[PDB]
Design an enzyme around this catalytic site. Structure first.
Site, PDB file in Angstrom:
ATOM      1  N   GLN A   6       2.157   5.704  -3.318  1.00  0.00           N
ATOM      2  CA  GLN A   6       1.998   6.836  -4.225  1.00  0.00           C
ATOM      3  C   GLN A   6       2.345   8.134  -3.515  1.00  0.00           C
ATOM      4  O   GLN A   6       3.323   8.818  -3.870  1.00  0.00           O
ATOM      5  CB  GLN A   6       0.577   6.881  -4.786  1.00  0.00           C
ATOM      6  CG  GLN A   6       0.392   7.922  -5.910  1.00  0.00           C
ATOM      7  CD  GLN A   6      -1.021   7.916  -6.515  1.00  0.00           C
ATOM      8  OE1 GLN A   6      -1.877   7.132  -6.095  1.00  0.00           O
ATOM      9  NE2 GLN A   6      -1.274   8.797  -7.495  1.00  0.00           N
TER      10      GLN A   6
ATOM     11  N   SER B 183       3.592   4.335   2.773  1.00  0.00           N
ATOM     12  CA  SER B 183       2.235   4.783   3.010  1.00  0.00           C
ATOM     13  C   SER B 183       1.380   3.566   3.265  1.00  0.00           C
ATOM     14  O   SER B 183       1.508   2.560   2.567  1.00  0.00           O
ATOM     15  CB  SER B 183       1.707   5.546   1.793  1.00  0.00           C
ATOM     16  OG  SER B 183       0.304   5.729   1.844  1.00  0.00           O
TER      17      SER B 183
ATOM     18  N   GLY C  82      -0.356   0.823  -2.105  1.00  0.00           N
ATOM     19  CA  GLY C  82      -0.421  -0.349  -1.242  1.00  0.00           C
ATOM     20  C   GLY C  82       0.898  -1.006  -0.950  1.00  0.00           C
ATOM     21  O   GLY C  82       1.102  -1.560   0.140  1.00  0.00           O
ATOM     22  N   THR C  83       1.808  -0.949  -1.905  1.00  0.00           N
ATOM     23  CA  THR C  83       3.152  -1.446  -1.667  1.00  0.00           C
ATOM     24  C   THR C  83       3.765  -0.745  -0.471  1.00  0.00           C
ATOM     25  O   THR C  83       4.521  -1.351   0.301  1.00  0.00           O
ATOM     26  CB  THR C  83       4.000  -1.244  -2.914  1.00  0.00           C
ATOM     27  OG1 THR C  83       3.514  -2.097  -3.955  1.00  0.00           O
ATOM     28  CG2 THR C  83       5.455  -1.533  -2.638  1.00  0.00           C
TER      29      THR C  83
ATOM     30  N   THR D  30      -8.706   7.252   2.135  1.00  0.00           N
ATOM     31  CA  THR D  30      -8.428   6.957   0.742  1.00  0.00           C
ATOM     32  C   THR D  30      -9.178   5.733   0.246  1.00  0.00           C
ATOM     33  O   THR D  30      -9.525   5.669  -0.937  1.00  0.00           O
ATOM     34  CB  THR D  30      -6.926   6.726   0.533  1.00  0.00           C
ATOM     35  OG1 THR D  30      -6.193   7.879   0.965  1.00  0.00           O
ATOM     36  CG2 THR D  30      -6.630   6.472  -0.937  1.00  0.00           C
TER      37      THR D  30
ATOM     38  N   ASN E 181       3.612  17.493   0.522  1.00  0.00           N
ATOM     39  CA  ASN E 181       4.955  16.994   0.298  1.00  0.00           C
ATOM     40  C   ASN E 181       5.972  18.083   0.565  1.00  0.00           C
ATOM     41  O   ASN E 181       7.083  17.817   1.042  1.00  0.00           O
ATOM     42  CB  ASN E 181       5.063  16.469  -1.132  1.00  0.00           C
ATOM     43  CG  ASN E 181       4.311  15.165  -1.327  1.00  0.00           C
ATOM     44  OD1 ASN E 181       4.463  14.233  -0.544  1.00  0.00           O
ATOM     45  ND2 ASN E 181       3.455  15.111  -2.350  1.00  0.00           N
TER      46      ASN E 181
ATOM     47  N   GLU F 293      21.023   8.809  19.056  1.00  0.00           N
ATOM     48  CA  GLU F 293      20.863   9.487  20.310  1.00  0.00           C
ATOM     49  C   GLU F 293      19.393   9.554  20.647  1.00  0.00           C
ATOM     50  O   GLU F 293      19.013   9.191  21.756  1.00  0.00           O
ATOM     51  CB  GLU F 293      21.505  10.868  20.232  1.00  0.00           C
ATOM     52  CG  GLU F 293      21.676  11.593  21.554  1.00  0.00           C
ATOM     53  CD  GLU F 293      22.440  12.889  21.373  1.00  0.00           C
ATOM     54  OE1 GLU F 293      22.724  13.235  20.207  1.00  0.00           O
ATOM     55  OE2 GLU F 293      22.769  13.543  22.385  1.00  0.00           O
TER      56      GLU F 293
HETATM   57 MG   LIG Z   1       2.109   1.182  -5.578  1.00  0.00          MG
END
Ligand SMILES: [Mg+2]
Lengths: 429, 441
Positions: free
Chosen positions: B11, B140, B144-145, B179, B228, B254
């Site tokens: 997210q 992240s 969770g993905t 979180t 962000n 490099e």
């Molecule tokens: Mg997700």
């Protein structure tokens, strides 16, 4: 005709030669377009030994572009005088060495050498009695040295009679622009001690010192610096380019400079160097510029004549004067600080004069002497190499190139051997 | 010629991505639809946008980046947002049912579900590209993905190309702020499957974003918009060399085995500055030395791990704008000068300058003030192992209590993955343990 060529790689050096040919263009007063707009045939007399006329009088360089990523090719390609070039030579890479020297030497080293050495060879046929060629890179990485190592090997074999006068940037002792420098450097210098014919040291910090103290400048960049060095490297061929009551070429120079072939790392001095007000303090004499000539602060290299001893010393004079002065200051100086003059080299100072100075000035001085003070240079860099090679720090980036460490030993006890070699010559009488 | 491409997951992660492409598109000023405000003149010397913004036969210049995440709500906002002319449909791949922050789910369970679509998209872009250096992958350890599915993602993508660079931006569990609580599971299960599929990557923690935006940006009440935005700046400058003229246009490859000298401990910090207000933009001067000395403020350290507790290894202070080799250079002497700082001495100096001539551009509606010079201190030290140790001790006990384990065992992971992954952080603890040892004599 003793004409020569240029080949540049190097993260900077690719810029350096840009400035260089730029300067020579000024001294030949030919338009950026490639036709002459000057006032004496003398610029045209010996023009060829750097330039090349083209059908229609496009006057062109005998330069060779090295790069592993076109940005520089675009850069100078975006360069004023850029229309004075030949599109042929824009030989670059699609990757970049990442400055792991093995990358630029095996990986990309073996990848793009061929097209270079071919076209360069076409330049070799373009050269009637080639005195040589000028290579340029830096001695700490691979952006130049990566491939330039292969150049010196290949052309050196391919032309065992030609002069290889090599300028590459030396890492200053203080500021480490990269930490892989000892390794690229050492691996290169193993090669360069064997294969290169002439070398002169290229520090940055000296150039800073010149710009800030003796130039009295606050804003350093590369481009000014390459002005300061291409001044000298531009002076070197002056007699070879122009008449001189006392002329000496690179063959006369090196043969008149080196006792034993392992000593073609030379330090450099060029002058005058003032800011604008200075002329309204001082004027120009041969004895004056002499009084700069033996200045450690003009000693543009990490070695100190004040600490080492002049194995050799020489003066490159362009202008119109009386050599009766020139010699007189020469011998005078060769006495005045005799102790830093090595002993059994009688008249270890040597002379020259070009009937014309560089443009803008009336008299020219250049000093490429060779003490042995560089021993601290190699000792340092070898030392850092030693430390992290104890650690093998960033060996993994390295061995990932698939070299051996024993090579590192080879350039290692190698380079130490060269150092101690200079020790005995310095410590002898 | 010099391409990179961005991948976005989790997210917060695709939040970052949205901020980023907003940014770059702002910075080359190509309008959100896909056109530039005006025609592009034909020139040479270096690339341009062509790295990332995608040339069409017309004013359609889409990024070279890809969205992948199994929680597809928010991404739709991009599917709806102003840049719905910007992006491209096949640029968009999402999962419906995300991981529920089962690492093992979007990594195993739903891991199986969208991979092939991802790889096909990758082949379309890399086939579309030529000199793509490396891979921008964002995710992240929370959404969770961002842990699981990304874990397979590099796990296979690396085995696909390999020779590309792995540009790793993912977020790390804030030290005391968080979180969830399965974060131990997400993280470490990621880590043992992260390392050998990672080239190098940095660890962005948020609490620093808060504290520093609130003090240095003078922020009162921030969120992922500010965060962000901030990571937007840092990545904005971490790749300028391939986008803009700089004196030493250093490159990722490099950076790779030079910043992270050994193979193993190949992560780092990154404290960008100068982040100040309009009322500190004035009332200040913002010297090269100010950004420089300021660059090493441990309190400025943009990830909550004390540098002063660690020993630095490398520092790639790539600079935006009117930089002087000399001035910075002497500042680097000043950095050698700092008694409190201590370096992996067997790497005495490993510095690597970056002087890109474009000073920074600012995003309207932002909080950062405008300046002339940027710094990115991508630096690597010994310090960062500790918070890891917190992670493996926290996770140590919680896992000892078998907490939540039913969730993961239910989805097709084995226990030795857990204890062994703890051996993984054991080894890396030996690595930060050992490389920090000063070589004898
Ligand atoms: Mg997700």
């Amino acid at each position: 005709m003793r004409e020569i060529v240029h080949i540049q790689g190097g993260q900077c050096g690719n810029q350096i030669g840009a400035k260089f040919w730029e300067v020579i263009s000024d001294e030949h007063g030919i338009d950026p377009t490639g036709t002459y707009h000057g006032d004496s045939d003398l610029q045209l007399e010996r023009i060829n030994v750097y330039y090349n006329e083209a059908t229609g009088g496009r006057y062109v360089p005998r330069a060779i572009l090295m790069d592993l990523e076109p940005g520089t090719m675009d850069s100078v390609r975006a360069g004023p005088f850029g229309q004075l070039f030949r599109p042929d030579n824009f030989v670059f890479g699609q990757t970049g060495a990442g400055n792991n020297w093995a990358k630029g030497h095996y990986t990309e080293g073996a990848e793009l050498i061929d097209s270079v050495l071919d076209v360069v060879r076409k330049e070799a046929e373009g050269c009637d009695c080639l005195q040589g060629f000028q290579i340029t890179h830096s001695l700490g990485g691979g952006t130049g040295s990566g491939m330039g190592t292969l150049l010196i090997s290949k052309v050196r074999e391919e032309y065992p009679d030609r002069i290889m006068e090599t300028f590459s940037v030396v890492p200053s002792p203080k500021v480490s622009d990269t930490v892989v420098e000892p390794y690229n450097a050492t691996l290169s210098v193993h090669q360069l001690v064997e294969n290169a014919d002439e070398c002169m040291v290229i520090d940055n910090e000296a150039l800073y010192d010149i710009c800030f103290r003796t130039l009295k400048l606050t804003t350093p960049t590369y481009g000014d610096l390459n002005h300061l060095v291409s001044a000298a490297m531009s002076g070197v061929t002056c007699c070879l380019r122009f008449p001189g009551q006392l002329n000496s070429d690179l063959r006369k120079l090196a043969v008149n400079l080196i006792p034993f072939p392992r000593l073609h790392f030379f330090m450099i001095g060029f002058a005058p160097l003032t800011s604008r007000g200075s002329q309204q303090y001082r004027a120009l004499t041969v004895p004056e510029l002499t009084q700069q000539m033996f200045d450690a602060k003009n000693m543009m290299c990490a070695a100190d004549p004040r600490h080492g001893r002049y194995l050799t010393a020489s003066a490159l004079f362009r202008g119109r004067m009386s050599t009766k002065e020139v010699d007189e200051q020469m011998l005078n100086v060769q006495n005045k600080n005799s102790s830093y003059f090595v002993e059994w080299i009688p008249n270890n100072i040597k002379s020259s004069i070009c009937d014309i100075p560089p443009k803008g000035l009336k008299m020219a001085v250049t000093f490429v002497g060779n003490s042995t003070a560089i021993q601290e240079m190699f000792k340092r860099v070898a030392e850092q190499f030693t430390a992290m090679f104890r650690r093998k720090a960033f060996l993994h980036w390295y061995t990932g190139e698939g070299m051996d460490e024993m090579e590192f030993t080879e350039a290692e006890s190698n380079m130490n051997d060269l150092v101690s070699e200079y020790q005995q010559y310095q410590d002898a009488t | 010629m010099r391409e990179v491409i961005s991948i976005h997951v989790g997210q917060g992660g695709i939040q970052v991505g949205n901020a980023c492409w907003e940014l770059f598109c702002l910075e080359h000023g190509i309008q959100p639809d896909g056109q530039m405000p005006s025609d592009k003149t034909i020139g040479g010397g270096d690339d341009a946008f062509n790295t990332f913004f995608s040339e069409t036969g017309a004013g359609k210049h889409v990024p070279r980046a890809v969205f992948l995440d199994l929680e597809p709500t928010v991404i739709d906002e991009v599917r709806t947002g102003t840049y719905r002319q910007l992006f491209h449909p096949e640029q968009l791949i999402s999962g419906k049912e995300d991981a529920a922050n089962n690492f093992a789910r979007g990594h195993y369970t739903i891991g199986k579900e969208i991979v092939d679509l991802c790889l096909d998209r990758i082949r379309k872009l890399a086939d579309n590209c030529t000199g793509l250096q490396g891979f921008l992958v964002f995710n992240s350890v929370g959404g969770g993905t961002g842990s699981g599915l990304g874990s397979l993602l590099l796990e296979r993508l690396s085995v696909d190309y390999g020779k590309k660079s792995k540009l790793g931006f993912t977020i790390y569990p804030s030290p005391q702020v968080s979180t969830a609580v399965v974060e131990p599971y997400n993280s470490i299960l990621s880590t043992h499957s992260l390392l050998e599929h990672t080239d190098v990557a940095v660890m962005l923690d948020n609490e620093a974003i808060y504290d520093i935006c609130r003090r240095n940006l003078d922020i009162e009440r921030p969120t992922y918009t500010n965060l962000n935005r901030l990571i937007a700046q840092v990545i904005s400058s971490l790749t300028a060399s391939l986008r803009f003229d700089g004196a030493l246009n250093v490159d990722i490859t490099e950076f790779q085995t030079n910043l992270v000298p050994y193979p193993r401990i190949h992560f780092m910090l990154s404290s960008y500055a100068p982040i100040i207000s309009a009322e500190k933009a004035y009332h200040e001067q913002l010297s090269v030395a100010e950004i420089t000395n300021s660059a090493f403020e441990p309190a400025n350290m943009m990830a909550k791990c004390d540098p002063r507790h660690g020993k630095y290894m490398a520092c790639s202070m790539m600079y935006r704008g009117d930089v002087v080799p000399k001035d910075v250079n002497a500042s680097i002497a000043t950095i050698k000068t700092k008694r409190t700082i201590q370096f992996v001495d067997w790497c005495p100096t490993g510095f690597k300058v970056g002087i890109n001539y474009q000073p920074p551009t600012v995003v309207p509606g932002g909080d950062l003030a405008k300046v002339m010079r940027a710094v990115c201190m991508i630096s690597n030290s010994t310090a960062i192992a500790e918070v890891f140790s917190r992670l493996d001790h926290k996770f140590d006990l919680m896992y000892a209590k078998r907490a939540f384990v039913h969730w993961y065992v239910g989805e097709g992971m084995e226990e030795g993955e857990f204890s062994e992954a703890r051996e993984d952080l054991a080894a890396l603890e030996k690595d930060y343990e050992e490389v920090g040892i000063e070589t004898a004599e």
